[PDB]
């Protein structure tokens, strides 16, 4: 069933933050993606068995992160790149500066 825009706002109104994440993730879109620690892209080749990862063109074999995002999100980001836009994802609020 549709848990569209409006239903979300109510949950935000109640302040029900965890429930909101379980609804928009754990029920529906829930996907795991590997990310380059350097260029926030989904360009990591996932070789789960030889622990081999690689980013190529970044040469990351060490600096790689795993995230939990909704598959629709993963699509939006990929479709952006498809349009030459880079949605770089970083795993630290401590902004560079």
């Amino acid at each position: 069933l549709r848990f569209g825009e409006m239903e979300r706002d109510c949950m935000i109104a109640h302040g029900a933050a965890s429930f909101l994440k379980e609804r928009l993730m754990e029920a529906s879109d829930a996907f795991r993606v590997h990310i380059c620690g350097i260029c926030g892209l989904m360009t990591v080749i996932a070789k789960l068995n030889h622990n081999q990862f690689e980013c190529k063109g970044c040469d990351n074999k060490i600096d790689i992160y795993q995230i939990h995002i909704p598959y629709a999100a993963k699509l939006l980001f990929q479709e952006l790149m498809a349009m030459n836009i880079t949605p770089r994802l970083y795993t630290d609020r401590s902004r560079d500066f």
């Binding site: 302040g15 029900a16 933050a17 965890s18 909101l20 909704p70 836009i85 880079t86 609020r93």
Partner: protein, 47 residues
Amino acid sequence: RCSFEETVEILFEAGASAELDDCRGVSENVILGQMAPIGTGAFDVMI
């Protein structure tokens, strides 16, 4: 701004001018499916 009317263009103008997103917005945490600075996500619980 994505979530409202001028989605595509907003992203373009944002990509063009290298915008950094804090990710401290409710609507932004929803897109990434994480807890947001809402009631339950305004404090951190530790041991």
